[PDB]
Design an enzyme around this catalytic site. Sequence first.
Site, PDB file in Angstrom:
ATOM      1  N   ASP B  92      24.063  -1.269  16.458  1.00 30.07           N
ATOM      2  CA  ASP B  92      24.066  -2.388  15.298  1.00 30.07           C
ATOM      3  C   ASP B  92      25.378  -3.302  15.933  1.00 30.07           C
ATOM      4  O   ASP B  92      25.985  -2.911  16.476  1.00 30.07           O
ATOM      5  CB  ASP B  92      24.180  -1.741  13.963  1.00 30.07           C
ATOM      6  CG  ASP B  92      23.751  -2.881  12.861  1.00 30.07           C
ATOM      7  OD1 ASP B  92      23.827  -2.177  11.704  1.00 30.07           O
ATOM      8  OD2 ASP B  92      23.728  -3.949  13.237  1.00 30.07           O
ATOM      9  N   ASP B 252      15.861   2.980  11.319  1.00 34.79           N
ATOM     10  CA  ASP B 252      16.722   3.858  11.255  1.00 34.79           C
ATOM     11  C   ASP B 252      17.164   4.303   9.856  1.00 34.79           C
ATOM     12  O   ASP B 252      16.927   3.394   9.200  1.00 34.79           O
ATOM     13  CB  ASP B 252      18.045   3.125  12.321  1.00 34.79           C
ATOM     14  CG  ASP B 252      18.556   2.086  11.143  1.00 34.79           C
ATOM     15  OD1 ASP B 252      18.209   0.916  11.067  1.00 34.79           O
ATOM     16  OD2 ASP B 252      19.764   2.605  10.623  1.00 34.79           O
ATOM     17  N   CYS B 290       6.015  22.450   9.335  1.00 30.23           N
ATOM     18  CA  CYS B 290       6.887  22.140  10.166  1.00 30.23           C
ATOM     19  C   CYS B 290       6.966  23.093  11.302  1.00 30.23           C
ATOM     20  O   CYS B 290       7.139  24.476  11.374  1.00 30.23           O
ATOM     21  CB  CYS B 290       8.271  21.780   9.778  1.00 30.23           C
ATOM     22  SG  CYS B 290       9.520  21.236  10.814  1.00 30.23           S
ATOM     23  N   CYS B 292       9.369  22.944  13.461  1.00 26.86           N
ATOM     24  CA  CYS B 292      10.888  22.993  14.218  1.00 26.86           C
ATOM     25  C   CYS B 292      11.289  24.391  14.159  1.00 26.86           C
ATOM     26  O   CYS B 292      10.959  25.448  13.500  1.00 26.86           O
ATOM     27  CB  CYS B 292      11.474  22.277  13.122  1.00 26.86           C
ATOM     28  SG  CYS B 292      12.684  22.881  11.994  1.00 26.86           S
ATOM     29  N   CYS B 295      12.431  26.092  11.022  1.00 33.70           N
ATOM     30  CA  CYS B 295      11.374  26.693  10.305  1.00 33.70           C
ATOM     31  C   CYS B 295      10.693  27.939  10.753  1.00 33.70           C
ATOM     32  O   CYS B 295       9.835  28.984  10.235  1.00 33.70           O
ATOM     33  CB  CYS B 295      10.445  25.772   9.721  1.00 33.70           C
ATOM     34  SG  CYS B 295      11.013  24.406   8.589  1.00 33.70           S
ATOM     35  N   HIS B 321      16.221  20.606  10.581  1.00 32.14           N
ATOM     36  CA  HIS B 321      14.812  20.358   9.982  1.00 32.14           C
ATOM     37  C   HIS B 321      14.485  18.932   9.643  1.00 32.14           C
ATOM     38  O   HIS B 321      13.299  18.581   9.850  1.00 32.14           O
ATOM     39  CB  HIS B 321      14.790  21.250   8.641  1.00 32.14           C
ATOM     40  CG  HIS B 321      13.638  20.899   7.908  1.00 32.14           C
ATOM     41  ND1 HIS B 321      12.434  21.094   8.276  1.00 32.14           N
ATOM     42  CD2 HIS B 321      13.473  20.271   6.636  1.00 32.14           C
ATOM     43  CE1 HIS B 321      11.572  20.740   7.240  1.00 32.14           C
ATOM     44  NE2 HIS B 321      12.248  19.967   6.454  1.00 32.14           N
TER      45      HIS B 321
HETATM   46  N1  LIG Z   1      23.553  -6.014  10.983  1.00 36.74           N
HETATM   47  C1  LIG Z   1      22.734  -5.563  10.148  1.00 36.74           C
HETATM   48  N2  LIG Z   1      22.562  -4.377   9.822  1.00 36.74           N
HETATM   49  C2  LIG Z   1      22.021  -3.786   8.599  1.00 36.74           C
HETATM   50  N3  LIG Z   1      21.557  -2.670   8.062  1.00 36.74           N
HETATM   51  C3  LIG Z   1      20.849  -2.844   7.335  1.00 36.74           C
HETATM   52  N4  LIG Z   1      20.632  -3.997   6.881  1.00 36.74           N
HETATM   53  C4  LIG Z   1      21.258  -4.791   8.080  1.00 36.74           C
HETATM   54  C5  LIG Z   1      21.424  -6.386   8.289  1.00 36.74           C
HETATM   55  O1  LIG Z   1      20.962  -7.025   7.520  1.00 36.74           O
HETATM   56  N5  LIG Z   1      22.259  -6.581   9.196  1.00 36.74           N
HETATM   57 ZN   LIG Z   2      11.362  22.596  10.018  1.00 33.89          ZN
END
Ligand SMILES: Nc1nc2[nH]cnc2c(=O)[nH]1
Ligand SMILES: [Zn+2]
Lengths: 355, 355
Positions: B92, B252, B290, B292, B295, B321
Amino acid sequence: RPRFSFSIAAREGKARTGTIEMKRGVIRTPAFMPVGTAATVKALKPETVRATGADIILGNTYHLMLRPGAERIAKLGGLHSFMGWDRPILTDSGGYSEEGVTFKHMLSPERSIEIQHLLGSDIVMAFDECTPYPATPSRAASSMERSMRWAKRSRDAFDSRKEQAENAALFGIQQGSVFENLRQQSADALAEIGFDGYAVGGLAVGQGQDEMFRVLDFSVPMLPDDKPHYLMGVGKPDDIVGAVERGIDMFDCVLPTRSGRNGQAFTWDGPINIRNARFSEDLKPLDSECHCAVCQKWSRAYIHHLIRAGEILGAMLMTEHNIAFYQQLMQKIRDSISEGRFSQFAQDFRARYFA
Amino acid sequence: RPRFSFSIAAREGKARTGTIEMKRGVIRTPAFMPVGTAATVKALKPETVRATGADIILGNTYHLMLRPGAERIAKLGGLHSFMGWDRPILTDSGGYSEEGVTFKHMLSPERSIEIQHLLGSDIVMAFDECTPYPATPSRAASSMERSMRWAKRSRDAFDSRKEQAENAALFGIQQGSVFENLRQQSADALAEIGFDGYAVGGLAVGQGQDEMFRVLDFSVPMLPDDKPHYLMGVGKPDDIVGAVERGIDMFDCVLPTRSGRNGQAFTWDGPINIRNARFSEDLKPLDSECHCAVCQKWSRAYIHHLIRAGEILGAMLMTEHNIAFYQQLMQKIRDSISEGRFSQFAQDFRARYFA
Ligand SMILES: Nc1nc2[nH]cnc2c(=O)[nH]1
Ligand SMILES: [Zn+2]
Ligand SMILES: Nc1nc2[nH]cnc2c(=O)[nH]1
Ligand SMILES: [Zn+2]
């Protein structure tokens, strides 16, 4: 497989190496037992505990009887099943009125053995009333006295449970504080009752290393030569080497685990605190010679960062390294005794470790 | 291997499945990226992250630039080496004056890209100034406006670093709050600059699921069809299914990890809090289906006990898990799209999960 077969393969001075054969597997001696407080060895899957080389782990009677409870663990299949360790497990008795102790819960030799029974322990400890160090001779022998009567009581409760007697082992615990005469009298009482192994109790608090060792110099020869000798709650790597030199076969301690989470790592050149800024850019593994997974993969600097950031992966890696080190230490002790070069080993070990 | 090759293998309605080929490996899409906050995915060795099925992980620019620092990580060999993950990593930008932001430290598009450069990120995010939700149209477009000028600035800094441009990818981030017109204008600005992929920013705070989804219904078609679409900071399993249905390719979120440590486990029949006393004697694994490791080995009751006792092994097992569940969810989405039965899948999924 046998219930409990101790064989001594080799000896050097007071030290011995050999095996303890049990239903759930073999224990190589001298043995280090990782402490699995609360049905887990802190921060490690059991598979990882095994990978480091452990043959047996220790569970605590007092802790598990309160949470999640003995009868509950029994209903869910026993401690082995519950925590996913199918190899031997030794349970402490909960010990560390003449009928027992009440606490804010009730414990006595009989309850202690039934709880360890419910847990499905492989090696059972007799219930005892630890002789706080220091001291007073006619006090320590009072405390020691009850212990010995409690050992008889534990022996009888264990033997009544024939499921327990046919499949598990019972260890007695020697008390006496640092009094040679109280230790001797405890040795005789215990050997008169008869146990599968003998522990040296009361030496895991206060007593510097010299005092501990002087007490071992006369205590351990008091024990039946032909049974395992277990030093409870010891210790540092140099404490272990010194106790083996004085005839100890089994060990437990929270040191590798606890001090791992605190950032202390054990190495052949001594312990280090990985939090120290000197490790910030150290690319070396924690120990130059450790064969552990951790030292094959991560550097001190990475583990430095995880621990300072309070990251759980840090505790995990440090604990795996430390248990691996302890197991590697036990293997080197075992090999060197079998090879008849343990006194050289102990010497070389101390030079470096303290250097 | 290619620097960045996105291919779409199959489509169903707005949803797509396919691959992103990069130097350090292939990413199967739709993709879930475990968040490795502080150079670790909380409570998991990277080998375990990989075992669960993850192809890429996310690192945070803001966190690592402060600790242990970008130049330090660079000197120790780059983030891959440092943390022991050799597969792709997306960083990020640190974003979540016209020159940048000062903080109690300095961040701007140029510094952001050089830091991600120093970290050795595979997928780089343009530096942005998140449009806090809610709102005001001539405010959100001001915020959006700077973002777009910053995206141009990130594009140029990235391309100047030819080591970066030849080996890594740059993603732009769409802003606009919930304003269809601000989103559109951001889409055009970004596609006018040209990025390897396009993220939908600003939807990871406040907005219930319905609002989020309505914003996706018009935002995602604004993005170039032929590049990956990444929804930042989303989300719950049902949020993911719904966003894929609206054309999202990458995700994410801290949810599986964080809520794992808190005792929340994700299952096909919905989330459960393993601390609940109803699990005290439940011998079933966390999820009946699952595949995994967890489990396969441990029951809800054991994990119940570890979490209530604050045991680290508990956090470890719950996190493994939960990441495994998310990865299993992504595999089922991928397979069902390829097979043209994703709408059936989404339906079946919701019935059960909410049941
Ligand atoms: N850089 C950035 N990270 C995020 N993480 C969740 N939303 C955003 C966003 O608008 N910009
Ligand atoms: Zn599991
Ligand atoms: N039961 C018991 N446990 C110990 N742990 C350390 N020392 C002792 C002891 O004397 N008795
Ligand atoms: Zn190591």
